[PDB]
Every structure is written in C-alpha cells, then in structure tokens.
Amino acid sequence: NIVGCRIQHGWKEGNGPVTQWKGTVLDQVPVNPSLYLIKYDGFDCVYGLELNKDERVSALEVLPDRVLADTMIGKAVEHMFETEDGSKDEWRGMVLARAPVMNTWFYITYEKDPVLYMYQLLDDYKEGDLRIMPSLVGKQVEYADGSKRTGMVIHQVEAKPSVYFIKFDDDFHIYVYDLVKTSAENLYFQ
Ligand SMILES: COc1c(CN)cc(CN)cc1OCCCN1Cc2ccccc2C1
C-alpha cells in the first residue's frame, strides 16, 4: 504493497468517538515492515502506525488512485508561518530529506518540536517564508526520574549521519534526534 496509496480509516481510542482520517502512505519501514509512515491530509507531522495490528484503526480502505531544490537538504532554516491571530511567527529547524512518494515535499524538524514534519518547502521559499541559513538503524532504544520509554531506530539521515528517526512504542509521532546533542543524552541503544 500500500506504499504510495491514499487511504482512509476510522480511529478510536478507548471508549472515545470514532474519527475519520484520509492520508497518503509514504513508507513501509524496512527494519519493521509492519510500520507505515503516513501523511494525513491537512496535518503537518509524519505519523507511524503498525496498521496490521493497531486495534485503534478500523475500516481501512484504499482510496482511488490520485498521486534542483535538493540544495536545501541538510540546511538550517528559519520557517515562517501565519498565526491564529494574523501575526507572523517562525520556527528554526533543519531540512532532513526529500519526502518519499510525495516527492515535491521535504522532511523537516524543529528545535521547538523535534518530531518529523513534512512541508512543500520550495513553495514556502518562493513565498518568502523560508530563510536558508549560511549501523544504529534497527537497534532498540530506551530512555529513562523513572520515565522508561522504549522504541526502535528506524532511519538515519544521509545528509547528517548523527541524526536518526526513532519510533517509540507509546506514540505515533516520529522522533528526530542528533545523537551528539543534549536532547539525546538519555537515549541508550541495544
Ligand atoms: C503553522 O504550521 C504551518 C502551516 C500550517 N499547516 C503551514 C506551513 C506551510 N506554509 C508552515 C507551517 O509552519 C512551519 C513551521 C512548523 N509549524 C509551526 C507550528 C506552530 C504551532 C503548531 C504546529 C506548528 C508546526
């Protein structure tokens, strides 16, 4: 496969209401083929779900088929955006890679929220909203006073090889870490 397909499904946590979601399947993770990375319409993060076993997913359907600036990859950037009150704000981050499947899009993450995001950064650049600044994959990871969180390293960023993507068992975001930085100092690997 469903990589490259558009999908829709219901979502239900506990006894809560069922919500309906539409998205695009970007990736079947090689080190965990149960794990799919998904871009949901209108939501900017990249999500990871083990679709074959996550009981929160219901009524999974495949939707009918729909669908250089590589110099930006690896760059530190300031990404400007419009706020709920009209004022402009910005987050600084790093362009990680071109997104798969949705190839005009780019993977990016930010110091203020170091999870995996996906944006049409060449459009934002043309609009004046992007300022360009001048073997662990497959291993288990844990971080832990008393917070004991488990996951897996799922990808290494080719353009900055100390940077990795991690999928934690307790959440559907994709977490991005530079293993030389303070943000990663409580991550341990096996
Ligand atoms: C506002 O999001 C953007 C949108 C809207 N879909 C669109 C675009 C593309 N023009 C950029 C955005 O922001 C680029 C920085 C990263 N965002 C800043 C932020 C603030 C609060 C909550 C989450 C985020 C993520």
Side-chain angles (χ1 to χ4, degrees), residues 2-21 23-65 67-84 86-87 89-157 159 161-180 182-190:
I2 47 171
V3 176
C5 290
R6 283 179 54 73
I7 58 169
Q8 62 178 19
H9 64 84
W11 180 262
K12 182 184 175 81
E13 291 207 83
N15 295 314
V18 182
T19 52
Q20 313 297 331
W21 297 88
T24 307
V25 180
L26 311 173
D27 186 21
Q28 180 177 23
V29 175
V31 293
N32 179 5
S34 294
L35 177 62
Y36 291 92
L37 305 188
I38 302 162
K39 174 68 166 61
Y40 289 98
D41 296 0
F43 292 80
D44 299 334
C45 290
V46 173
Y47 293 91
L49 292 178
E50 293 177 302
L51 291 172
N52 63 2
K53 61 174 67 63
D54 193 328
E55 299 200 335
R56 298 170 296 180
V57 177
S58 63
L60 179 65
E61 300 172 280
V62 175
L63 296 172
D65 305 279
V67 79
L68 256 177
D70 296 322
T71 70
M72 289 180 20
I73 294 169
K75 293 289 190 304
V77 300
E78 183 171 274
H79 199 183
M80 300 144 61
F81 59 91
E82 185 179 349
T83 64
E84 49 260 25
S87 56
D89 198 359
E90 57 76 25
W91 284 10
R92 292 179 169 202
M94 189 176 48
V95 185
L96 300 163
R98 191 175 296 272
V101 170
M102 299 173 66
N103 51 37
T104 63
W105 298 62
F106 290 83
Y107 284 170
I108 176 165
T109 192
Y110 307 95
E111 296 178 83
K112 285 185 171 192
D113 194 20
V115 295
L116 187 58
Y117 281 84
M118 197 171 150
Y119 289 105
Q120 295 173 106
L121 292 182
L122 183 58
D123 288 351
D124 292 349
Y125 179 83
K126 293 174 190 175
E127 290 302 311
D129 281 350
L130 191 69
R131 179 166 182 164
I132 311 301
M133 304 285 193
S135 54
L136 274 176
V137 177
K139 299 291 195 293
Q140 297 287 326
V141 59
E142 75 89 44
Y143 78 76
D145 192 71
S147 334
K148 159 63 168 176
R149 192 173 195 199
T150 52
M152 183 181 293
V153 181
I154 64 160
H155 278 129
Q156 179 184 35
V157 181
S162 63
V163 180
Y164 294 84
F165 298 174
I166 288 171
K167 172 68 170 61
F168 289 115
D169 306 330
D170 63 7
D171 190 48
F172 41 55
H173 293 89
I174 303 306
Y175 290 76
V176 184
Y177 297 94
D178 184 346
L179 299 187
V180 309
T182 293
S183 60
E185 73 187 359
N186 297 313
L187 302 176
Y188 299 75
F189 303 89
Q190 182 187 289

